[PDB]
Amino acid sequence: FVFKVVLIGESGVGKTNLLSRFTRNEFSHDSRTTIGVEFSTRTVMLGTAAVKAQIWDTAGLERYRAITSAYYRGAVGALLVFDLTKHQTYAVVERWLKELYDHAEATIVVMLVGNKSDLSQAREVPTEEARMFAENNGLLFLETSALDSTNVELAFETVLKEIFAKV
Amino acid sequence: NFVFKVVLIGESGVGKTNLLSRFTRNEFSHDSRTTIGVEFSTRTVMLGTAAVKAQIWDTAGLERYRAITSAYYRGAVGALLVFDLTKHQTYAVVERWLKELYDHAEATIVVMLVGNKSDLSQAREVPTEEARMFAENNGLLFLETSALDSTNVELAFETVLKEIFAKVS
Amino acid sequence: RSLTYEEVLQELVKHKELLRRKDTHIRELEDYIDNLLVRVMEETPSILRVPYEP
Amino acid sequence: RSLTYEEVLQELVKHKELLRRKDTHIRELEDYIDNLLVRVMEETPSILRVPYEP
Ligand SMILES: Nc1nc2c(ncn2[C@@H]2O[C@H](COP(=O)(O)OP(=O)(O)NP(=O)(O)O)[C@@H](O)[C@H]2O)c(=O)[nH]1
Ligand SMILES: Nc1nc2c(ncn2[C@@H]2O[C@H](COP(=O)(O)OP(=O)(O)NP(=O)(O)O)[C@@H](O)[C@H]2O)c(=O)[nH]1
Ligand SMILES: [Mg+2]
Ligand SMILES: [Mg+2]
């Protein structure tokens, strides 16, 4: 099993560090906006099945780009990430969900992720508002920190499990 | 049959991209933008009884180190080193271009020095005889071309292919 | 020496035009990248792997 | 509003700073392009053909 998973959401929310945390257990306090498109992999054992996650990443830019179709093409999973310290990143989440469904295949498993949980003091999005939006739209929901690690394995592994349950 | 890799080299603005489009596509553009990246186009001629494909590469004429330089020259059997005959500076730097060429290709690669933009010759700054003489003294072919009105564009690339072919057989 | 108001204002005007040209060329580079990546993603997506494994 | 000398100069300093960041970004984009093309040229050079044949 190889499951293509995409990372979507605003610039700055932590997509690239969630990728590097999950796939290499590495984090960079410095990272700049991503150029182009890349992917990294991690393979887990689910029951008795080896499952490779092939997780794609690009800058969270709202404008039209040529790569958008091919980015979403064949994806069976998505993490739609906002920064829980930045309310603008959450407000705009219905717009990303719009894009996902325009390009994504029908059976895509979607998890809404509020990243930067380690910055609880600068929080601008209540867990509750985000959970309910997720529940209303049939999306999974978690809060993570790529920085300290909280829920990062759980977030990617829960998506892979739900994909695996379907396939 | 044969595939000969040929590179275009020389200062930004001399007409490399337009010589390539004029030969391989019979197209020319007034757009003055420097080439981004690296591209190649092909044209196949018959030399004697052989079908010979010219695979001609293009990139911007930048002096600075670039990661793509080695792979750009790798496997090349010919080079057109181009200048703008209306801009003396583009000619003055020809030997720096040859130096770079011979850091990446064998010393006896077939090379044509090309003085491009001949339809602008009312504003010539490089004498035909002077560049012809330089080409002769350095073992280079030479021609003046115009990618805009086509003058000598076919001859320039077909002469390079003919020499490579002679040398290879 | 101290620049006059007009000298400072000319520098600002010049910088505004340079900014416009730089923004134009950034989008040209970004558009090149995107067009190239469409071809890569479709033909040989392994090139996009991090870390790269030839 | 007629900007004062200090307001013009501040607008200039801000542009100068914007320019430095735009220049760094341009070179980041150029380096990305060069590094990607190296791999394309090694593995699948036909991607660079003009006109393109998939
Ligand atoms: N405190 C904290 N910082 C984080 C966390 N995740 C990412 N960051 C920091 O947030 C900044 C942006 O992270 P990055 O992963 O590059 O964001 P991105 O979503 O990929 N941005 P873009 O879409 O432009 O490429 C970085 O300075 C990074 O170190 C986190 O969980 N906690
Ligand atoms: N009149 C005339 N103009 C030409 C001729 N060749 C090229 N040009 C024009 O000269 C300018 C630059 O040509 P171009 O082919 O882009 O040059 P280049 O050598 O590829 N530049 P770079 O190395 O930066 O990519 C363009 O505006 C082009 O239309 C020519 O033979 N005659
Ligand atoms: Mg990123
Ligand atoms: Mg060019």
User: How is chain B split into domains, by residue range?
Assistant: 1-169
CATH class assigned to A1-167 = alpha beta
The ranges assigned to domains in chain D are 1-54
Per DSSP, helices labelled H in B60-152 are: 69-73, 88-92, 94-102, 128-138
Assess contact for B143 and B80: CB atoms under 8 A. Answer: no
Q: CA–CA separation, B115 vs A2, rounded Å?
A: 56
Kindly state whether B33 is in contact with chain C, defined as any CB-CB distance less than 8 angstroms. yes
List B143's β-bridge partners, or say none.
B114
E strands, A77-136, in order: 77-83, 109-115
**Ligand nearest to the CA of residue A29, numbered in listed order:** 1
Q: What is the resolution of this structure in A?
A: 1.8
Dist CA A66 CA A69 (whole Å) = 7
What kind of fold does domain B1-169 have according to CATH? Answer: Rossmann fold (3.40.50)
Question: Can you read off the two tokens belonging to residue B17?
Answer: 């991209």
Method by which the model was determined: X-ray
CATH class name, domain C1-54 = mainly alpha
The binding site of B for Mg(2+) comprises: 17, 35, 58
C16 in contact with D, Cβ within 8 Å: yes
Contact list, D47 vs chain C (CB under 8 Å): 36, 39-40, 43-44
Encoded amino acid at A64, one letter = Y
CB contacts of A38 in chain C (<8 Å) are 48-50
- The pocket around ligand 1, CB under 6 angstroms, is made up of A 11-17, 28-29, 31, 33-34, 59-60, 115-116, 118-119, 145-147
Give kind and range of the element (H or E) at residue A44: strand A37-46
CB A39 within 8 A of CB A72: no
